[PDB]
Amino acid sequence: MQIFVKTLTGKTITLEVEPSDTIENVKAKIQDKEGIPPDQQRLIFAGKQLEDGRTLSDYNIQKESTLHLVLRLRG
Amino acid sequence: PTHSCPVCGMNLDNASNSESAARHVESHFPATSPQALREREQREFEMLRAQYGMDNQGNFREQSVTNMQRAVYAGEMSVADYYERTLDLRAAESCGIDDGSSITRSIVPRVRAISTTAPNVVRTLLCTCVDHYASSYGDRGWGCGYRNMQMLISSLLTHTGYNERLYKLWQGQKPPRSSVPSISRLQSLIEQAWSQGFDIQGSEQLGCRLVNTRKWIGATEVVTLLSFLRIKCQLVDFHRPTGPGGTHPELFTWVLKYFENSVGGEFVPPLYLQHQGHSRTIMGIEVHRDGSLILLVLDPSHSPQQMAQFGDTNSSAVALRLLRKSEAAMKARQYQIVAVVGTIDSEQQYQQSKILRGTRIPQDR
Ligand code: NA
Ligand code: NA
Ligand SMILES: [Zn+2]
């Protein structure tokens, strides 16, 4: 199924995912597509930072959801 | 149904356990009553952009004027003070220099006097010198990374070798050699560094725009700026806890070894310290009588009035608690440190420093 990953600049990419994919897997797909190292990626959905070991299903992330991608450690 | 989802009305009695039931409910955040999903995306997008300042909205001068005026109407600042502060600001900003309004001087001798007489302290290992820069009217809420840059630059400028490199940022103008760049000037220098190819990855992350914004920065922008100015840094990534209860003993060990180079009298600058959402400056470390290590951490969120206590007639022994951080007080999941370690001495190394490189502790690469 398709979801979207959007950075805070508005750059939006689409990913092919499944509900049983882990967050770690999604960050790997982001790296495959955009070359962004997973250790720089902070994925946010519905006010939570998504944990690498959980699945999209755990977070109730359905088709056409947008995950927001925050990069690096800033403040 | 003893309990169902208050947003979508799903029967939660058949959930695998209470965690999964609660996790389903929380997936509707921020909705708490029966309420498209593209709307929640927009709201979250806007709230994250406002938090990180990634919408470019506002700037230092505007926030200064607004917050100083609010202080005037609140009875906190006289109209006379409004005029003096505004004039000082315009004058210093005309030269790209910080106006000095939020500085507290001579931090090292003041902290050393209190620390070395503290009863449980056996060793006090400090950077050579540092001034404290507090966030103020124009940058409160977002300026922390820049203020910490200012604190580090204030120390580096006392070293003639580093002063020679940093002074190049003035690009023709000839201010006093101890002048520290303003926040707006720092934003400009980072944009200039980006446009010459420094950290293309990072400039893209920040929308290729920093001047006249209130945008959060982090350790990589520190490295970008100093590398641009031909100063060699190291970026150390303490990417996960290394001790019990989520603590970072390996970060404290690293800082101890860093400052152990300070007892020889050679110049040692402070350290830039990042965690998620906020940055600070490590100015030193104490060894207490049981052997435990206590960081001395300057923080731009502390006011000049708080920092004035270290020079006071009283406020000393317990006032030091403001700077002290034990391992139990440093429980962010991740920290990054930027240390200045020397100078970039050739065009080859200069060009190579345009691709930022970090060190991971523990090593996982
Ligand atoms: Na702006
Ligand atoms: Na403290
Ligand atoms: Zn529901």
Numbering used by the authors:
A (entry chain B): 1 to 75
B (entry chain A): 223 to 257, 263 to 592
The authors write:
While fruit flies lack a ZUFSP protein, the red flour beetle Tribolium castaneum encodes a ZUFSP-type DUB in which a 5th Zinc-finger appears to replace the MIU domain. To further investigate the increased activity of TcZUP and the basis for its K63 linkage selectivity, we reacted a catalytically active fragment TcZUP218–592 (excluding the first four ZF domains) with the activity-based probe Ubiquitin-PA and solved the crystal structure of the covalent adduct to a resolution of 2.0 Å. The catalytic core domain of TcZUP218–592 assumes a globular papain-like fold with a catalytic triad consisting of Cys-371, His-505 and Asp-526. Similar to human ZUP1, the insect protein has two helical protrusions: α1, which corresponds to the zUBD domain and contacts the Ile-44 patch of the bound distal (S1) ubiquitin, and the α2/3 helix-turn-helix region, which is positioned on the opposite side of the catalytic center and might interact with the proximal (S1′) ubiquitin, which is not present in the structure. The arrangement of zUBD, α2/3, and catalytic core is very similar to the human ZUP1 structure, with a RMSD of 1.3 Å over 304 residues. A major difference between the human and insect structures is the presence of an N-terminal MIU domain in ZUP1, which is replaced by an UBZ-like zinc finger in TcZUP. In the crystal structure of TcZUP, the UBZ folds back and contacts the S1-ubiquitin moiety, which is already bound by the zUBD domain. The zUBD surface that recognizes the Ile-44 patch of the outgoing (S1) ubiquitin is highly conserved between ZUP1 and TcZUP. The same is true for the recognition of the ubiquitin C terminus: Arg-72 and Arg-74 of ubiquitin form salt bridges with Asp-406 and Glu-428 of human ZUP1, and their corresponding residues Asp-426 and Glu-448 in TcZUP. Ser-528 of TcZUP might—despite its unusual position—help stabilize the tetrahedral reaction intermediate, while the corresponding Gly-514 in human ZUP1 lacks this ability.
